[PDB]
């Protein structure tokens, strides 16, 4: 049984913790629930850590007093199809292999499934670790509670004796690097300096061997990613997000200075040997838009190349951990601002961006966002009970599973079938434009080998490559974003029409140049 | 927001509660969750209650940390 | 009403039948249930047949005493979509037409449906008889009991006056030959010599006119294909299977000599004029793995060509009736062993194999097979009754329809939804690799005309054709096999990655050769 | 066996932390957890039938007991 420790003794040194803990809703929650610090207290000084105390990062540290939120969080939505490859005719991007050729995502890119699996899915996907990690057997794929208990309770490593990234099966890639883990777990929150900079007090950084890092990590989406464990108040911990909102001064709502002020973030920094080490961002309000934007954003988390001179940008560069914090129509400018692109297309040779799940930046400016609606209203609403203490569902999933609480409470004029029909009208129309965009991109891509082989000039091929950048961006945003246009249908429509226009321009340019060569 | 009380000071006069509380699974659960004893502590001796402390009997006193058991009960 | 005949009188001549009938569970079942032999008894000698007795092959001969098994067998699973073409974006092989071009399957290849329809579906598919046979009208497609009663009760022949194979509609083929029928019916069991060799006592053989043969056949999957009618004991009758297991000495489990010994087969031969004529294989145990492997295997049942010299191998050759009895990683060696391939690709000119539903050979070595599980455990389990005499379901279908009896009885840790999720994780991942394999095959195939037209050398085109063989085999195994990887997911994954690797090698070879030609 | 085994059993979850139901009620609402876990030989309908056999027989004897008490009282 737990025995409480004297917190006043800790507070003698830990004034920041004291200021947070004594004021918030965890003022009665003793440190022993999450820390074992006996030898630490015996050996620390006011500025030196001494022996390092143990800190629990497991979600069961909170499940003892908050069982309802924990049990809701770990639920597995079996209807969210698992390991479902997006590059197929029946999924999101039928022509993805042709369009993304040259990028690691061509090796495998599945649809998202329930949050319990994020860290295990990161470890086992074919594009990440060369196939090094696998579930212990094919039955473990169902075990959400198990993954939450710890990745290494349900996974195996093909070679515990080596720590290099390499292929264990032929059609894999080794795209994983330490920055990825920041959107899968925060078990390393005390072992990682802000932004993943080299730091004397950090065990891990952007330049670590990712296989060694991986082995030290266990839990998905820790409860404390959105809730400060000391004050119980709302916060974010993701360094890339804090850097965009605070360091770069862009605000929580870059298009709306007023809302940014009302719903802002305060950066709090913690030190090691009196030098800045790690930071959190305390939120003015429990604003899920900003909490979910710790991960559901377009980012860089990988090496790439400079737009200016084509030279390599490695994990050591700050650009390898970056939130663009820009909507699709500001993205090209945001990438120029850091002089960066992701890959060269295997067939066209064009410099291209790689886009990732930009839900937060898409939602900006939408009718719902402008009316003060936030991700949690549709994806993790209050539970409705005939008799009971209300709590917030923590099973983040499509609103189709709880339409009464997620939509119909605000849309009293609709039945459930009418609301579903409205969602499907947008998704159907948007998907049709994604498919047309891919058709035009593919038609352009197919013309590059023909044009090269017919002796079309580099100048013309380079003009087509510049068009490919825009055709790609204005399409890939929407296969990356998970709502199939629902979060911002007018924006999806305008962007996808732009993609098509750019591809058509490129097709015309290449067809005319090929025809002229043949005529000579 | 609740502010914890000095449980050790209570135990100077409440050895019977001490022997139960310090040993079981509520050893970390501060008295302020269920008792309002400020004026009691100001006025008591080990041999004189002084002002009577307040004790919560409402089931919500338990529902803060045990919402699942409470919600299942009230169905 | 039936009147019993004196069996002792038959046994005077039929000592093999006597030894089987008097010992097994049909010792009380009189011959008159299946044979009308009055004129036979009057005219036969100990070595000459005399007048030929009538033998019932209809399944209703068994339905009289085994109504539950019969009624279960003839059920139609309406959820198994009928006449569903595999070469479409929403079915198993979106790029099948490009990949299989040159083979008869391009004319039509539908997904399997319930067993009642096997013989009628064989007769009416567009690739089989030039469109000669059709259901009497489009309503008869529902009539499972009717098909069982007899193919010719529900079908029409466009020209009863001719017996040649020819096209009656433009987009048909005439791929059917007498060997096919062995996996659709055994109505010809007394009229077909072992392997379909020419034989004085056989009316039909590999070289028969298939249209004439077709007209003599009526019933699908006769009950006696798995059950000896004389002993009621377990058996197989399929000559190709007996030839692999017994004549070639490969055993019932080629990867496991011990299991092969415990679960073996004894070949029993029947003679005509004291020369060997037909054979059956009695099983040591009621082992459904071997019973279902009478048909659910990769086979040759068609003419083809020799790998060595390209020369024609016709129906007259023993190779036209052949069970490879090899897993996907031993198949290329098994085809070299008989010096055989199926067709030349219409676009690439490569010699290619054609693979067919290799469920039995895929299942070998899987976790379930290694633990003693067999096809019937998942596809035709015991019926569970609150009060009743238990019998075995004979409706062979996906376990999704009886998850309590087919999975959850062994997997007590799972709910039905969790078990379904585990199956779908494998099928989704496997299908994504099938789709990627087809993408790479198609990219290679498309380069052949470009390379030929650019003047790439025969030596390079032949190197690419040798790669095409392997790229094709390691892909087509999985579109042919019906479990979408479930029967052996690690094997499907390794094979599909091999297919992709081979295609990528071929693409690189061809792109480089085309580029070099253009540079000259 | 104790009252809680039939009237406030542990919750069964595909994924989650087990806790004890505190909704004290008839086992007919949670037969999987209140009976069928110990009585593997039964379906839910069979277990309900066994309950109703006892209650039907008992209630019949209650009614007959009241008939005779009423006849005496009168
Ligand atoms: C002064 C003598 C201290 C007392 C008493 C306690 N701690 Fe401490 N702690 C101290 C220092 C100088 C540091 C390094 C960081 C800094 O502020 O300069 C720490 C660090 C921690 C940590 C972080 C450990 C890590 O892995 O990074 C934790 C969780 C921690 N301390 C907890 C803690 C608790 C619970 C105490 C009372 C039981 C406590 N500390 C006493 C200095 C001192
Ligand atoms: C019991 C010993 C607790 C442990 C361990 C944790 N929490 Fe807690 N939490 C506790 C209480 C008594 C309260 C206040 C209840 C009330 O409403 O008065 C809380 C409150 C929270 C809140 C709400 C905060 C707010 O609204 O301002 C959150 C978000 C919260 N707690 C989260 C949390 C997490 C993430 C934990 C694991 C690190 C955790 N709590 C542990 C009791 C206990
Ligand atoms: C980084 C730590 C994340 C935060 C914070 C949130 N999400 Fe998330 N989400 C994340 C990943 C890595 C995944 C895929 C997990 C996998 O194993 O595939 C997801 C998935 C979702 C989904 C899909 C769930 C399904 O049933 O398929 C939804 C609806 C979702 N995420 C929403 C969501 C919301 C609303 C958030 C703020 C409350 C949120 N997520 C935070 C990574 C992270
Ligand atoms: C936060 C900015 C993220 C970083 C950095 C990484 N990922 Fe991620 N991931 C993120 C979200 C919000 C989701 C769910 C939404 C979606 O569109 O998928 C994911 C999902 C995954 C998955 C599951 C889906 C799939 O693509 O197969 C995998 C396997 C995954 N992520 C791996 C991954 C790797 C290898 C990363 C570094 C290169 C990486 N992620 C970074 C959020 C974030
Ligand atoms: C961000 C992606 C979150 C993670 C991870 C966790 N929770 Fe949460 N929590 C979140 C939101 C948006 C809210 C609602 C705030 C509002 O006022 O609208 C909550 C709320 C809580 C509470 C308060 C009581 C309630 O409303 O349910 C508690 C006790 C709480 N959350 C606990 C909790 C635990 C234990 C988690 C890990 C399993 C957890 N939260 C993760 C957002 C996020
Ligand atoms: C209601 C007005 C919504 C708000 C606010 C947010 N989202 Fe959403 N989302 C919404 C719908 C109707 C859909 C389509 C769901 C369907 O079943 O068709 C989505 C989709 C998602 C997804 C994918 C979910 C899935 O299909 O499994 C994700 C990952 C998601 N949304 C995330 C998300 C985030 C992070 C938000 C705040 C920035 C957000 N959504 C707002 C409805 C609503
Ligand atoms: C949070 C501040 C709490 C309040 C208020 C109450 N309890 Fe509690 N309880 C709490 C914790 C952290 C634990 C230990 C969890 C663990 O598993 O270690 C408990 C435990 C219980 C138990 C189980 C005890 C045992 O098995 O020996 C019971 C029956 C229990 N608590 C009941 C209970 C009641 C009736 C309360 C209101 C008077 C109550 N608790 C308040 C945290 C908190
Ligand atoms: C009634 C006159 C029968 C006809 C016609 C057929 N069978 Fe039969 N069968 C019959 C009996 C009385 C028994 C034994 C029942 C018992 O369990 O004691 C059987 C048994 C079978 C078995 C089980 C054999 C074994 O377990 O060893 C099979 C597989 C079987 N019968 C099949 C069968 C088939 C395929 C028939 C048509 C050719 C057929 N039977 C006819 C009674 C009668
Ligand atoms: C040759 C005589 C066969 C034997 C012996 C078995 N099967 Fe079969 N199967 C066969 C054919 C020709 C077909 C397709 C029939 C059609 O008209 O399309 C099938 C089909 C199946 C299916 C699919 C059923 C559905 O609902 O779609 C299954 C699940 C199946 N077969 C399984 C099966 C099992 C388990 C067997 C041994 C008990 C078995 N089959 C024997 C040909 C033959
Ligand atoms: C046993 C080794 C077989 C031989 C020889 C033939 N077929 Fe077949 N067929 C077989 C099985 C086990 C199945 C079901 C599984 C599947 O993948 O389809 C089938 C199915 C058919 C079907 C229905 C499906 C379709 O392809 O449209 C048809 C029309 C069919 N078979 C025709 C056919 C012809 C014309 C054959 C000789 C060239 C032939 N089959 C041989 C098993 C076996
Ligand atoms: C192989 C593809 C089969 C065909 C065709 C038929 N049956 Fe069958 N039968 C099969 C198996 C694998 C079993 C179970 C053997 C075991 O012990 O596990 C059976 C069983 C029977 C029985 C025995 C009683 C029972 O278990 O149901 C009978 C009477 C029987 N089968 C009859 C039967 C009839 C009448 C069929 C044609 C409609 C028939 N079987 C086809 C495999 C195969
Ligand atoms: C359980 C461990 C199984 C054993 C043993 C066998 N098969 Fe199977 N099969 C299994 C699953 C879970 C599936 C996918 C079904 C789904 O609905 O997703 C299959 C599929 C088939 C099919 C196609 C069925 C259909 O989808 O209609 C066939 C023709 C099939 N399997 C045949 C088969 C044979 C002949 C086996 C013994 C060699 C065999 N299966 C074993 C589960 C299991
Ligand atoms: C399972 C072996 C049981 C144990 C142990 C206990 N009870 Fe029970 N109880 C049981 C049944 C099958 C029924 C009839 C319910 C029905 O729907 O027909 C009952 C009934 C009750 C009732 C009335 C419940 C109602 O009908 O709403 C009460 C108040 C009740 N039982 C209390 C009770 C107590 C206090 C027990 C321990 C001493 C106890 N039961 C044990 C099954 C079982
Ligand atoms: C007697 C009639 C009870 C009342 C009133 C309350 N609870 Fe209870 N509780 C009861 C039993 C029989 C059990 C299980 C004991 C066992 O080990 O089998 C429980 C358990 C708890 C626990 C432990 C965690 C769990 O098993 O769920 C907690 C935290 C708990 N109970 C809390 C609780 C609260 C908050 C109540 C008032 C709403 C409450 N209990 C009433 C018996 C009784
Ligand atoms: O690939 N370096 O960890
Ligand atoms: O791949 N995760 O964005
Ligand atoms: O095509 N010969 O039957
Ligand atoms: O086409 N039947 O394998
Ligand atoms: Ca999903
Ligand atoms: Ca990006
Ligand atoms: Ca089917
Ligand atoms: Ca073949």
Coordinates of C-alpha atoms and ligand atoms in Angstrom, one line a residue, chain C residues 77 80-81 111-119 121-122 182-185 221-222 225-226 288 291-296 375-376 379-380 396-398, ligand 9:
Chain C
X77 CA -25.2 -18.7 -48.8
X80 CA -21.6 -15.1 -51.0
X81 CA -22.0 -12.7 -54.0
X111 CA -15.4 -15.4 -57.0
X112 CA -16.4 -18.8 -55.7
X113 CA -20.0 -19.3 -54.4
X114 CA -21.8 -22.1 -52.5
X115 CA -20.9 -25.7 -53.5
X116 CA -24.4 -26.6 -54.8
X117 CA -23.6 -24.6 -57.9
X118 CA -20.1 -25.9 -58.8
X119 CA -21.0 -28.0 -61.8
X121 CA -21.0 -22.6 -62.7
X122 CA -18.3 -24.6 -64.4
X182 CA -12.9 -34.1 -61.8
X183 CA -13.1 -31.2 -59.4
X184 CA -16.9 -30.5 -60.1
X185 CA -18.5 -34.0 -60.0
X221 CA -19.6 -32.7 -55.3
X222 CA -21.1 -36.2 -54.7
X225 CA -16.2 -38.0 -52.8
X226 CA -15.2 -38.1 -49.1
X288 CA -10.7 -32.9 -43.9
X291 CA -10.5 -34.5 -48.3
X292 CA -10.8 -30.8 -49.3
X293 CA -7.4 -31.0 -51.1
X294 CA -9.2 -33.1 -53.7
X295 CA -10.1 -29.7 -55.2
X296 CA -8.7 -26.8 -53.2
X375 CA -10.3 -27.1 -42.8
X376 CA -13.5 -28.6 -41.3
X379 CA -15.5 -24.2 -42.4
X380 CA -17.8 -27.1 -41.5
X396 CA -18.8 -25.2 -46.2
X397 CA -18.6 -21.5 -45.9
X398 CA -16.7 -18.6 -44.1
Ligands
LIG9 C1 -14.1 -30.5 -55.6 C2 -15.2 -31.6 -55.9 C3 -14.3 -29.8 -54.3 C4 -14.1 -30.4 -53.0 C5 -13.9 -31.8 -52.5 C6 -14.4 -29.2 -52.1 N1 -14.6 -28.0 -52.7 FE1 -14.9 -26.2 -51.9 N2 -15.4 -25.4 -53.7 C7 -15.3 -26.1 -54.9 C8 -15.8 -25.3 -56.1 C9 -15.7 -25.7 -57.5 C10 -16.3 -24.1 -55.5 C11 -16.9 -22.9 -56.1 C12 -18.3 -23.3 -56.4 C13 -19.0 -22.2 -57.3 O1 -20.1 -22.5 -57.9 O2 -18.5 -21.1 -57.4 C14 -16.0 -24.2 -54.0 C15 -16.3 -23.2 -53.0 C16 -16.0 -23.3 -51.6 C17 -16.2 -22.2 -50.7 C18 -16.8 -20.8 -51.0 C19 -18.3 -21.0 -50.6 C20 -19.0 -19.6 -50.6 O3 -19.9 -19.3 -49.7 O4 -18.6 -18.7 -51.4 C21 -15.6 -22.6 -49.4 C22 -15.6 -22.0 -48.1 C23 -15.2 -24.0 -49.8 N3 -15.3 -24.3 -51.1 C24 -14.5 -24.8 -48.8 C25 -14.3 -26.2 -48.9 C26 -13.9 -27.0 -47.7 C27 -13.7 -26.5 -46.4 C28 -13.8 -28.4 -48.3 C29 -13.5 -29.6 -47.6 C30 -14.5 -29.9 -46.5 C31 -14.2 -28.2 -49.7 N4 -14.5 -26.9 -50.1 C32 -14.2 -29.3 -50.7 C33 -14.7 -27.4 -55.1 C34 -14.6 -28.4 -54.1

